[PDB]
Amino acid sequence: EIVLTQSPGTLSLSPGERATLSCRASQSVSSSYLAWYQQRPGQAPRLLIYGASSRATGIPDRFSGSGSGTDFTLTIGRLEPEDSAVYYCQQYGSSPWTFGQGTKVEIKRTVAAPSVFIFPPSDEQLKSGTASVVCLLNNFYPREAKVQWKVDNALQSGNSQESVTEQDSKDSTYSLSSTLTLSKADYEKHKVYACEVTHQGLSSPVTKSFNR
């Protein structure tokens, strides 16, 4: 068991720029006994370099393992949207072998203007369960996109639950799905539900409209 320091993690990296990941070891480890694992979001980790010396079969030459004994650095010759992932350095010199804390990599090809869709609550949801309200923020990059719900054209507290998907392997874009939970019984005075969005994309925040 060796405690190992790791690179900070999330970084903004342009495509075609070399990326370096630091894997220092507090306790001395074998000069070439380190395994690099890359996991795509919702994907199992895949070995890239074995012994921090040579790339595994089917792994691109751009990923390279450098450094020995204490500090191990992974350097990528070219950066792509597919390259962005979480990287773990595992030291198998001492047993039990210790995996790296991991370093998320983020590639932003360009800022993406958000697309906002309002999903009006269906009659079937009113008949059974709470109808609620749904708002979509497709292609909003970067991850920092803020949506606030508006009820009856009046300020609404942000109790809405919002989930943002990780960047796609090729698209490298983030999509957000804020949803406001409203009781079906409490559907009287409110006539309009909207999700105003503040983001780098777009000239100004745009309010939505339900009516129906």
Place this chain on the structure above:
Amino acid sequence: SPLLSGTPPQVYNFKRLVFTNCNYNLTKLLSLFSVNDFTCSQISPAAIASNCYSSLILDYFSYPLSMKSDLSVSSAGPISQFNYKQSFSNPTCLILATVPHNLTTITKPLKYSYINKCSRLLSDDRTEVPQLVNANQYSPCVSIVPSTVWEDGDYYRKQLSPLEGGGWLVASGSTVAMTEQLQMGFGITVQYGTDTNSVCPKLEFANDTKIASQLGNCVEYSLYGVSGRGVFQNCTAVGVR
């Protein structure tokens, strides 16, 4: 002296010392070490200490007292099965000893280690055949295993050249805690010769055989192929020595 010098090897990597034509002093070696366990097969231990045989074979390795039962031809234990085997046909004497603190120049391995299992995968994917060590031979799976097993649980695999046999060879590594005083196991497989007895105990000759004991007495002499009855008297040397 070669047995004393350096560090004793593991049971699988046991070194072999063979003495064919020299006077032997087993008692002196037994005095140097403290033998916790003494056993012999097909001959008495006292007889082995003082007898003439065609050749003497000594195998020296570091073996702990706790697993001594496992290393037996009768025993079905894995260590005897895959590491060291002693020929049944020749008389075999097995000695386990612990190095004394006074004894010096005996290097100690980090821990005692043995090959837990030795097996070879067949060419068929679902077929595996275990490999059992033949008498001695230094073990079949010894090459994959390092001189000292790195971890208590270890996996070793290597591939035989195809044709033949193109079948993977798989070995297991196991270790036991090192004793404060090093424990060494010795396997002896002397070969008796009906017409030849090259190696004899030290010292084979006795005072009665020496002329000085029988000086001044009418005695029968059988020296260097000459047999006669004569009286030996000490006198100034004459003739070519």
Place this chain on the structure above:
Amino acid sequence: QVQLVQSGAEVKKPGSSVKVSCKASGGTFSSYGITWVRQAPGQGLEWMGRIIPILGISRSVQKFQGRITITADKSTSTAYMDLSGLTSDDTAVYYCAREGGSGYDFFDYWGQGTLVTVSSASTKGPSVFPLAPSSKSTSGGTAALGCLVKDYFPEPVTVSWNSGALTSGVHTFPAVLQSSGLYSLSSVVTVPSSSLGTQTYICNVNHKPSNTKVDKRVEPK
């Protein structure tokens, strides 16, 4: 090359005996070690145990030693781990990875993984929210309709458009815990046709604990 597959995700009470099964494909086992890796959510991977079926040897990590019984058989061609007496905190995704050897502790291939959650709570059947296609839509450029699985106690439900035939324009959002203990995840798809869409049948839904597959015809409104 042997493809690695793992048992479907299961939910058990804390301290229950739970078995995760990893099977070598082709009905035969290659001469390779099998490793079990536990990854806590938002945490680095942790090695749990190493078993080689051909060797028959079993090894476990010091953190989890003697609470897990691991058996691997070449004839079975399946390597499985049984965990008993595990604490509620122990819940994590489990992965099975091929091992070159003790001298080569690097995993070329990893299993899809099994998520086991240990909690003393009743499982809740998933409810699919109405697609409710947006009233405002692009004029033939695209149409946005999404069916979102909601109120499911055990992760993770899998939702597929056209039974997984349509892999284009689909956005899946990771489940986010609400104030209620039950949590939900979001699925939406974009179809170029304003009405009808690429296929009338879409939004096939399967719950991994339920093991029930339901196909519903979808009409844009």
